Amino acid sequence: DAEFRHDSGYEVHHQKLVFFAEDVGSNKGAIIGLMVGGVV
Amino acid sequence: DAEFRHDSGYEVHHQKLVFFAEDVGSNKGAIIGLMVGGVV
Amino acid sequence: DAEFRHDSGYEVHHQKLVFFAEDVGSNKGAIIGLMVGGVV
Amino acid sequence: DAEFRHDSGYEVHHQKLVFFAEDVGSNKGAIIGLMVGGVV
Amino acid sequence: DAEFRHDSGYEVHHQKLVFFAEDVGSNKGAIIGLMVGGVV
Amino acid sequence: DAEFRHDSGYEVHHQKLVFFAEDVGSNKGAIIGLMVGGVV
Amino acid sequence: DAEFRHDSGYEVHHQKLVFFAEDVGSNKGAIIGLMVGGVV
Amino acid sequence: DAEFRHDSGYEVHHQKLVFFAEDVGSNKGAIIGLMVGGVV
Amino acid sequence: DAEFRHDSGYEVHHQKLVFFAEDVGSNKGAIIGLMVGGVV
Amino acid sequence: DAEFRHDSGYEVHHQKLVFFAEDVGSNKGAIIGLMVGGVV
Amino acid sequence: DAEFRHDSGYEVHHQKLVFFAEDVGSNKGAIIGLMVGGVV
Amino acid sequence: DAEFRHDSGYEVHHQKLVFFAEDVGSNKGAIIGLMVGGVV
């Protein structure tokens, strides 16, 4: 879920950088050992 | 869940940088060992 | 959950930097060993 | 949960910096060993 | 939970800096060993 | 839980700085070893 | 680079857990923009 | 590079778990833009 | 770089847990923008 | 760089726990914008 | 850089806990904006 | 940089706890904006 925009007019550089990001690692869930339980 | 915008008009540099981010590590869940319990 | 905006008009530099962020580490959950308990 | 805005008109520098952030470390949960207890 | 705004008109510098933040360390929870107790 | 605003009109400097923050260290919870007790 | 051993003789439980690990996140390198420099 | 061993004799449980691991994320290298530099 | 050993003889429990770890987050390197400099 | 050992003879419990660790957060490097400087 | 040892003979409990650790937060480096300077 | 040892012979308890640690927060470096200066 994301929307990215790059818009420019008159831009002068030698060295310009732009960077976006959200996530690089896990988010949920690795293991379960159980006998009773409701979960999502 | 994110919305990013870069908009510019008259910009002059030698070296310009822009950077966004939210997350790099885990968020939830690594392990469970249980006998009784309701969870999410 | 985030909304980021960069908007500019007349900007002059040699060296300009902008940076945003929220999170880099864990948020919840590493382990449980239990016999009785309701949890979320 | 966050909303960030950068808006400018007439800005002159050699060196300008802007930085935001909320979190870099954990927030909750590392371990539990128990026999009886309700938790969240 | 946060809302950040940077808005400016006529600004002149050589060196200008702005910085916000809330948190860098833990907030809650490292360990428990118990026999009886209700917790959150 | 926070709301930050930076708004300016006619500002002239060589060197201007602004900084906000709330927290850098822990807030609660490191360990418990108990036999009987209700807690939060 | 690792060596793990689990060796046991007479062991009695209902619930026994063992866990090892080293790394879950990055170690090095995300980006570079440069004009002059020796690096590794 | 790893060596793992599980060896057991007389073991009694209802629920026993064993887990090893080293790595789940990147280790090196994402991008470079340069004009001069020795690297590895 | 690690060496882990679990060795036991006569052990009696209901609930026994063992856990090791070194690292979960980054170690080095996120970005550079430079004009002159030797680095590692 | 680490060496961990668990060795035991005659041990009796209901609930025994052991835990080691070194690191969970970053160690070095987030960003640089410079014009002249030697670094490591 | 660490060496951990747990060795025991005749040990009797209901509830025994052992815990080691060194670090959970950052160690060095968040940002730099400079024009001249040697650094490490 | 650390060396930890736990060694015991004849030990009797109901509830015994041992805990070591060095660091939980930052050590160095958050930001710099400068025009001239040698640093480490």
Residue numbers in the entry:
A (entry chain L), B (entry chain K), C (entry chain J), D (entry chain B), E (entry chain H), F (entry chain I), ...: 1 to 40
Can I see the authors' text?
One fibril morphology, termed hereafter morphology I, was relatively abundant in our samples and associated with a relatively small width of 7.4 ± 0.4 nm and a short cross-over distance of 41.5 ± 2.3 nm. Implementing this symmetry, we reconstructed the three-dimensional (3D) map of the fibril at 4.4 Å resolution based on the 0.143 Fourier shell correlation (FSC) criterion. The fibril consists of two stacks of peptide. The cross-sectional layers of the fibril contain two Aβ(1–40) molecules that fill the entire density, demonstrating the absence of major disordered regions. Each peptide stack contains four cross-β sheets, termed here β1–β4, that extend between residues 2–8, 10–13, 15–19 and 32–34. The β-sheets are uniformly parallel with respect to the orientation of the hydrogen-bonded β-strands relative to one another. The β-sheet twist is right-handed, whereby the direction of the twist is defined by looking along the main fibril axis. The central contact site, which occurs close to the fibril main axis, is formed by residues 24–26. The two equal contact sites at outer radial position involve cross-stack heterotypic zippers between sheets β3 and β4. The stacks are offset from one another by ~2.41 Å, corresponding to the fibril pseudo 21-screw symmetry.
The peptide and its associated fibrils form parenchymal plaques and vascular amyloid deposits underlying cerebral amyloid angiopathy (CAA). While Aβ(1–42) peptide is thought to be pathogenic by the formation of toxic fibrillation intermediates, Aβ(1–40) forms fibril deposits that damage the cerebral vessel walls. To shed some light on this issue we have purified and analyzed the structural features of Aβ amyloid fibrils from the vasculature (meninges) of AD brain. Using cryo-electron microscopy (cryo-EM) we show that Aβ fibrils from brain tissue are polymorphic but share conserved structural features in terms of peptide fold and protofilament (PF) assembly.
